[PDB]
Amino acid sequence: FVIGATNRPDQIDPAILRPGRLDQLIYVPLPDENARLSILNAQLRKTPLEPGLELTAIAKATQGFSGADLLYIVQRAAKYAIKDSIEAHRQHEAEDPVPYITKEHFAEAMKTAKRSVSDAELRRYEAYSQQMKASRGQFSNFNF
Amino acid sequence: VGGLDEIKEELKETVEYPVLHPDQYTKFGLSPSKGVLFYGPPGTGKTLLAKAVATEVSANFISVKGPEL
Amino acid sequence: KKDNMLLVDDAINDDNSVIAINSNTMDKLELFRGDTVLVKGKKRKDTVLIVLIDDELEDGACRINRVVRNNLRIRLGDLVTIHPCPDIKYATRISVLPIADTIEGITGNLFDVFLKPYFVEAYRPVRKGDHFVVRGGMRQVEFKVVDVEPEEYAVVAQDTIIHWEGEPINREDEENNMNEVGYDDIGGCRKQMAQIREMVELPLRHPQLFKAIGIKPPRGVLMYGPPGTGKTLMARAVANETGAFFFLINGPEVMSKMAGESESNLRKAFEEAEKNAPAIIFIDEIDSIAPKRDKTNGEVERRVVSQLLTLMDGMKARSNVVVIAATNRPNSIDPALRRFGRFDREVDIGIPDATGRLEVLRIHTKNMKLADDVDLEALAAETHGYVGADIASLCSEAAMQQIREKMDLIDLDEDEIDAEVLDSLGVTMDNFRFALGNSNPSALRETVVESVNVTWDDVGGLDEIKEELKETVEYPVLHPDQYTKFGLSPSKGVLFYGPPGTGKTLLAKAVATEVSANFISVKGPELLSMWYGESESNIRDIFDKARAAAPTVVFLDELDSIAKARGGSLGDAGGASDRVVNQLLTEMDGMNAKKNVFVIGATNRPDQIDPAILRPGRLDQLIYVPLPDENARLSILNAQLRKTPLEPGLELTAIAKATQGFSGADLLYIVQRAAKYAIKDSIEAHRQHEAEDPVPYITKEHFAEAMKTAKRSVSDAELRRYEAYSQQMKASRGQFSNFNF
Amino acid sequence: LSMWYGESESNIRDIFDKARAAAPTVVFLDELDSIAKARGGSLGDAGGASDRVVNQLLTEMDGMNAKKNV
Amino acid sequence: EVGYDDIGGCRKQMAQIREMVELPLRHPQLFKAIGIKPPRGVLMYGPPGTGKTLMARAVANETGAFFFLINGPEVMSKMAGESESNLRKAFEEAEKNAPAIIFIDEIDSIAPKRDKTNGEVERRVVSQLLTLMDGMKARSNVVVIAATNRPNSIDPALRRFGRFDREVDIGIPDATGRLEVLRIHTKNMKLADDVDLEALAAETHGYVG
Amino acid sequence: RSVSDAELRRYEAYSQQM
Ligand SMILES: Nc1ncnc2c1ncn2[C@@H]1O[C@H](COP(=O)(O)OP(=O)(O)O)[C@@H](O)[C@H]1O
Ligand SMILES: Nc1ncnc2c1ncn2[C@@H]1O[C@H](COP(=O)(O)OP(=O)(O)O)[C@@H](O)[C@H]1O
Ligand SMILES: Nc1ncnc2c1ncn2[C@@H]1O[C@H](COP(=O)(O)OP(=O)(O)O)[C@@H](O)[C@H]1O
Ligand SMILES: Nc1ncnc2c1ncn2[C@@H]1O[C@H](COP(=O)(O)OP(=O)(O)O)[C@@H](O)[C@H]1O
Ligand code: BEF
Ligand code: BEF
Ligand code: BEF
Ligand code: BEF
Ligand SMILES: [Mg+2]
Ligand SMILES: [Mg+2]
Ligand SMILES: [Mg+2]
Ligand SMILES: [Mg+2]
C-alpha cells in the first residue's frame, strides 16, 4: 500500500497516476464552516477552555483559512495566555491566576492571523480538479 | 484529524479491507486496490492522515522522505 | 522502609573500630555494646565495627569516624546497610602494611610502637582491604590489612598473630581500589540502565522465577546512540560489580594476517568464555566486524560475519552466556545479527534531560572540594545540548581555569609547591560560567559560529519586533511546564523580510550572542554541492544535528537562494533545487518528533518564496521590518554612537528630522564618514604639532561636513514593491474586524 | 563561474575566505555587470546561478563573519 | 635542537599546551588536591605553516617524557589485520615504557569520518583508534597530540572529550607575533647595525609562519 | 480515465513518424 502526498500534482509522471499503481487520486479540499469547527474542536481537545467560549464565531469569521492557520491562532492564544500567566506570576512574586484561555486571548490572537494559500493557487487546484472531472466525461445516471 | 469524514472513512476501509477479509476477495476472484494519492493545498491534513494511519492501523509502516533515498 | 539501613553522620567516639547507634535503635534492632557488626556500603565494599549506645546519635543515621567512613567509600550524608555478623571469630593471623607516605622519615619497630598497643586487649574486628590509622610518635601512620587467615574478616584477640612487613608502597593500589566504577555513576538513563541490569542481574541472583515461568531470559544487548553517552561506562560497571566471568573483545582486535586466524581467535575467545563460568562477553565497536555482508567486497569480513552468526546462534550455540555490544551507528549491522537470540533487546541510551544532566553534574562533582556557593540546578538548566560526556569536560575546564588563576598570582615554586595554598583551592561560580561560555556540545563542533559581539541594547529601535522575537525564543525554553499543562506545541518559525540595510542580520547576530539556546548558522548557497544528493545529505545532516542537541535555533539566511518556489526554470539544471525545496519542506514539517527547531529566515525578496514554506508549522510569523521613523532613527543614532566620545552640545534631533528617508546602513555610513573626517583632522593636527590628544571627541563640524554626500540606499520603486507586498499581506487578512464576542 | 552546481559559489566562498583569512587584503571585483546583473527574474538556469552568486556575495561581504578587513 | 623559545608569537596556545604537558608531569599535587584528572588530548589545527610540528618538536625535546612519533599513512599496510596491529604495537610501546607523549601527525589521513568512504580498512583503523583512545583501561599516564591542516574531516567520535578535547587554534599572528618571528629567525645571522624589524613586521600582513 | 489528451497526440506523432 503506497501512499503519496504531493502538494503539486503537475510535476508527477502520467504513468504513475495510471490505475494499478496509484488509482485513488483523493483531492483534499479546503475546510468549510462545518469542518473548521471540528478542526478547532480536535485541536483544542487536551486543553482547559472557558465554559462560555464558543468556536462558532471563529469558524464563521474565517472562510479561506486552513488547519495550519487555525493551529497558528490556537498557538498565539496559548502564547498570550502564557505571557499573562508569567506576568501574573511576576506580579505575585513582587507583591494559579490564569486557569484557562479566556476570550480576550482569542480576540488578541485573531488580529495577526492570515490565510496560507492565496487565490491563484486555489484557482490552479480547482482547475486541476475540473480537468480531472473533464477526464470523467460522458457520465450520467447510467441506466442499463 | 478534524474533518475529512468521507476521505478518512474511504482511506481507512481501503487499508483495512484486504488485511482482515481475504476470503471475500478470493470468493469474488479479484485483487484489491493498492495505492492512494493525496493532493491539494499545503497544510490540510495529508501528513496528519499518514500519521493517523501509522499510529494505530495493524499494518506495518515504512516511512520514507522524498529525496532521502 | 526496613529500619536496617542508615545514613552516615559525624563521629563522637574517635576510636577506629567503632560505630554509634542510639538506644531507640537498639530496641528497634536487637544489638549490644560489645556486638561486632558488619557495615556494607557503596562500591561493593564492607567493614566491621563495634556498636555502642549513643544518646546524640538519633535513630535514623549512624556515627562513624572518618576511617570507617573511608573504607566504605562513603561520605557524611550517604546511606549504608548495617547488619550483624557473629559468625566471624578470633583471628589466626593478620597481614598489615604501612602506606609509604605515612612513614617517610622514620624507621624501626612499627609493631612495638604502633600496632602492639593499638590491637592490644581491644580484640578489634578488622577486615581485608581495611586501612586503619594509629597515632603515636608525633605522627599518624596508615596501615592496610592485606590478608587474614579466617576468611575476609576476623577479630584480633591477644592470641592472634600480627604480621607486619616493611617494604611500604606509594598508594597507586589504594587509588585503583577507590576508583572501581560503581552502578551509581551512570545516573541519567534510568530505563536503559534498568533494561540492561535486569537481564544482567536477575538470571544470576535467583533463577527460580525463570524456572517457574518456564521461558528463558533474553541474552543480548545492543547499546546504540550518539557517541559519548555512557555505553562503555555501563560495560565497565557491569564488569566491575557483577561477580561472573568477564571477557572484553575490541572491534579490530581478532583480525590477523593469516588466512583463517580471526575466526579461530573468535572461536577460542567464545570457548574460553564458555569454559570457565556463565560469563558476559562485551564485543565493543561491532561496526568493524559486521559490514552487512552485501556492501563489503572482501572475504575475511564475510567469514568473520559467518563465524559470529554461527557461533552466536546455531547448534549447541550458547550455554548460559550473554553477549553485550556497543556501537555508534546501528544501521551498518547485519539484520541477521540484529535478530532474536543474538542481539534482540536494543536499548537506546540517548540524549539526556535536565534531571539527567543534574544527575551527571552531581555525580562528577562529588569528589572535589567545590565551594559553598555553587549551585548545580542553574548549571543543569542552562546546559541544553550536551551529550552527557561534555559535562566532565566542563568541570575539568573549570578546575583547570581555577588552577591557572591560582598559579599566576601566587608564585609557582617550581622546586616544591607550598602546601598552604592546597588546603584552600575550591571551584568558584564564575569559573563554571567561563567554562560554560568557552565550550560547545561535541556534536556541533563542526558548525561553530564565529564569536560576534553585539547586544540587545546595540540594536536600536524595533522594540515590538525585539520583544516578539524574545518571546518566541525564550517561552518554550524557560517555561516548558505551562506548555505541557496547556497541552499545545509552541510556535517555532519566524521570517524577516524588508528593505536591505535594516537590521535583519543584526537581529540574527543579537540572537546568536545571548539567547538561551544553541545557534547553527548557514549562508544561502552554502549547503549546495556538485554531486547528486549531497546537498540533500547536507540538509538532512544539519537538521539532524539541529534537532539532536535540542534546543537550537537555525538561521536560514537567504531563503531566496536556498528555496525557489517550484520548477521556475524552463530548462532544468538536473532537477536539484526542487529536491532541496522538498527536503526543506519535509525537514521543517514532516514525519519527525519536532522537539525544538526554531527557523529564522532573513530575506530581501519575498516574491520568490514558496507558499508551502510561507505556511504555518514551518514559518508562520511573517515579521516585516520597516524603515525607521523619527524615534527609531534617534534610537539607532544613539545606539550606533554608544561607545564613542562626543561633544556635549551635540543634538541628534536635526539629523533625525532632516534625513526622513534614510536607513540604518546609511546612518552608519554617515557616522563612519564623520569618524573618518575626525581621524583625518587628528592626523593633520598631530602632524602639525609634531612638525612645529589634539581632538578628544567628534565635533558638530565633522558631522556637518560628513552629511554633504549622504544618499539614500533604497529607491522609490523597491519601497513601492515592499509596501505593495505588505498591503497584499494585509489584504489576505480580509473579512475581519475588531471581533468582539 | 563554473559548469557544475554550486562550484561558482564555492569559488566565491574560497576567494572570500582567502581575503578575510590573511587580512588586510583588498579585492578588485571587476565587471559587476557580469557578476551581479541585478537579478529580477529571468526564468532560467543562468538566472538561478546569478541569484545564487548574488546571494553568496551578499552573505560573504556583509554576513555572519568577523569582517576584519575586506 | 629547538626549545620552547622558538615559537614566539603564539604564546596563548603555547601556554594552553604547556599546561597540560608540564603540570600533570612536574608536580601532580594540585590535581591530586582538587581530585580532578587533567585533560589528555591536544588537537592543533589551523592554516598550513603555523608551527604545530615545531611545537611537537619543542615538547619532545624539552620534557623528559618518552616521545613516540606516529606519522599519518606510515601505519598502513596491504595485509588484512596489520594497520590495527601496528597501532596497537605503537600504543603498547608508548604505554609500557614510561608516562609518554604520543604525536599522531596528519590525523586526517586515518580518519575519513566513517561515512564518505567505502573501504573497510579505514573504518577498522578508525575503530581501533576509537577503542585504544577511549575504552576499558584506555590510557594510563599517556597523552596524544594531533596536528592537521583541515579540522572538519575528522570523526565526531574522535572530536570528543577523552580522545581530543582541547582543540587549540594555532592561527595567524598579529604584528607583535611577526616581530617575535623576525627577532627569533634573525638571531643567528649577523645582518647589520642600521636595520629595524618593527617596520618589517608592520609592512607585511599575510605572512603566516 | 488513465491517459490524457497530449500523450495521445505525442504517440500519434511518433506513429506517423515511424
Ligand atoms: N484537518 C486538520 N485537523 C487537525 N489539525 C490539522 C488539520 N490540517 C492541518 N492540521 C495541523 O496543521 C499541520 C499541517 O498539516 P500537515 O498534514 O502536516 O500538512 P500537509 O498537508 O502540508 O502535509 C498538522 O500537522 C496539524 O498540526
Ligand atoms: N551518562 C553519563 N553519566 C556519567 N558519566 C558519563 C555519562 N556519559 C558520559 N560520561 C562520562 O564521559 C566520559 C567518556 O564516556 P565513555 O563511556 O568513555 O564514552 P562513550 O559514552 O562514547 O562509550 C567518562 O568520563 C564518563 O564517565
Ligand atoms: N536598525 C538598526 N539598528 C542598529 N544598527 C543598524 C540597524 N540597521 C543597520 N544597522 C547597522 O548597519 C549594519 C548593517 O545591518 P545588517 O543587519 O548587517 O544588514 P541588513 O539589514 O541587510 O540585514 C549593522 O551591522 C549595524 O552596524
Ligand atoms: N609560528 C612559527 N614560529 C616560528 N617558526 C615557525 C612558525 N611557523 C613555522 N615556523 C618555521 O617554519 C618551518 C616549518 O614550520 P612547521 O612547524 O614544520 O610547520 P608545518 O608542519 O605546519 O608545515 C620550521 O623551520 C619552523 O621553524
Ligand atoms: F503540503 Be504540506 F506542507 F506537506
Ligand atoms: F564509545 Be562512545 F559511544 F564514543
Ligand atoms: F541582509 Be541585508 F538585508 F542586506
Ligand atoms: F603545515 Be602545518 F601542518 F600547519
Ligand atoms: Mg507533509
Ligand atoms: Mg565505547
Ligand atoms: Mg543579511
Ligand atoms: Mg606538520
Curated annotation (Swiss-Prot), chain A:
Domain of life assignment: Eukaryota
Cross-link (Glycyl lysine isopeptide (Lys-Gly) (interchain with G-Cter in ubiquitin)): K46
Compartment(s) of residence: Microsome; Endoplasmic reticulum; Cytoplasm
Phosphoserine modifications at: S118
Protein family membership: Belongs to the AAA ATPase family.
Summary of the function given for this chain in its UniProt record: ATP-dependent chaperone which probably uses the energy provided by ATP hydrolysis to generate mechanical force to unfold substrate proteins, disassemble protein complexes, and disaggregate protein aggregates. By recruiting and promoting the degradation of ubiquitinated proteins, plays a role in the ubiquitin fusion degradation (UFD) pathway. Has a role in the endoplasmic reticulum-associated degradation (ERAD) pathway which mediates the cytoplasmic elimination of misfolded proteins exported from the ER.
Miscellaneous information on this protein: Present with 78400 molecules/cell in log phase SD medium.
Subunit comment: Component of the heterotrimeric CDC48-NPL4-UFD1 ATPase complex. The CDC48-NPL4-UFD1 ATPase complex interacts with the HRD1 ubiquitin ligase complex composed of the E3 ligase HRD1, its cofactors HRD3, USA1 and DER1, substrate recruiting factor YOS9 and CDC48-binding protein UBX2. Interaction between the complexes is mediated by interaction between CDC48-NPL4-UFD1 complex member CDC48 and HRD1 complex member UBX2. Forms a complex composed of CDC48, NPL4, UFD1, UFD2 and SHP1.
Name recorded for this polypeptide: Cell division control protein 48
Origin species: Saccharomyces cerevisiae (strain ATCC 204508 / S288c)
Lineage: Eukaryota, Fungi, Dikarya, Ascomycota, Saccharomycotina
Name of the gene this protein is made from: CDC48
Parent-record interval covered: 628 to 796 of 835
Swiss-Prot record, chain C:
UniProt crosslink position (Glycyl lysine isopeptide (Lys-Gly) (interchain with G-Cter in ubiquitin)): K275, K292, K316, K492, K509, K564, K643
Outcome (variant: K504 to A/T): Severe loss of catalytic activity. Lethal
Residues where Phosphoserine is found: S442, S489, S715
BP GO annotations: ATP metabolic process; autophagosome maturation; cytoplasm protein quality control by the ubiquitin-proteasome system; DNA replication termination; endoplasmic reticulum membrane fusion; endosome to plasma membrane protein transport; ERAD pathway; macroautophagy
Subunit and interaction comment: Component of the heterotrimeric CDC48-NPL4-UFD1 ATPase complex. The CDC48-NPL4-UFD1 ATPase complex interacts with the HRD1 ubiquitin ligase complex composed of the E3 ligase HRD1, its cofactors HRD3, USA1 and DER1, substrate recruiting factor YOS9 and CDC48-binding protein UBX2. Interaction between the complexes is mediated by interaction between CDC48-NPL4-UFD1 complex member CDC48 and HRD1 complex member UBX2. Forms a complex composed of CDC48, NPL4, UFD1, UFD2 and SHP1.
Organism placement in taxonomy: Eukaryota, Fungi, Dikarya, Ascomycota, Saccharomycotina
Family: Belongs to the AAA ATPase family.
Keyword entries, A-Z: ATP-binding, Cell cycle, Chaperone, Cytoplasm, Endoplasmic reticulum, Hydrolase, Isopeptide bond, Microsome, Nucleotide-binding, Phosphoprotein, Protein transport, Repeat, Transport, Ubl conjugation
Location of the protein in the cell: Microsome; Endoplasmic reticulum; Cytoplasm
Cellular component GO terms held in the UniProt record: Cdc48p-Npl4p-Vms1p AAA ATPase complex; cytosol; Doa10p ubiquitin ligase complex; endoplasmic reticulum membrane; Hrd1p ubiquitin ligase ERAD-L complex; mating projection tip; mitochondrion; nucleus
Record protein name field: Cell division control protein 48
Organism domain of life: Eukaryota
Annotated organism of origin: Saccharomyces cerevisiae (strain ATCC 204508 / S288c)
CDD domains, sorted: RecA-like_CDC48_r1-like, RecA-like_CDC48_r2-like
InterPro entries found in the cross-reference section: AAA+_ATPase, AAA_ATPase_CDC48, AAA_ATPase_domain, AAA_lid_3, Asp_de-COase-like_dom_sf, ATPase_AAA_core, ATPase_AAA_CS, Cdc48_dom2
Predominant subcellular localization, coarse grouping: other
Result of changing R445H: Restores cell growth
Enzyme Commission (EC) number: 3.6.4.6
From Swiss-Prot, chain F:
Compartment annotation: Microsome; Endoplasmic reticulum; Cytoplasm
Source organism, top-level taxon: Eukaryota
Residues modified as Phosphoserine: S4
Family affiliation: Belongs to the AAA ATPase family.
Subunit structure: Component of the heterotrimeric CDC48-NPL4-UFD1 ATPase complex. The CDC48-NPL4-UFD1 ATPase complex interacts with the HRD1 ubiquitin ligase complex composed of the E3 ligase HRD1, its cofactors HRD3, USA1 and DER1, substrate recruiting factor YOS9 and CDC48-binding protein UBX2. Interaction between the complexes is mediated by interaction between CDC48-NPL4-UFD1 complex member CDC48 and HRD1 complex member UBX2. Forms a complex composed of CDC48, NPL4, UFD1, UFD2 and SHP1.
Role this protein plays: ATP-dependent chaperone which probably uses the energy provided by ATP hydrolysis to generate mechanical force to unfold substrate proteins, disassemble protein complexes, and disaggregate protein aggregates. By recruiting and promoting the degradation of ubiquitinated proteins, plays a role in the ubiquitin fusion degradation (UFD) pathway. Has a role in the endoplasmic reticulum-associated degradation (ERAD) pathway which mediates the cytoplasmic elimination of misfolded proteins exported from the ER.
General remark: Present with 78400 molecules/cell in log phase SD medium.
Protein name: Cell division control protein 48
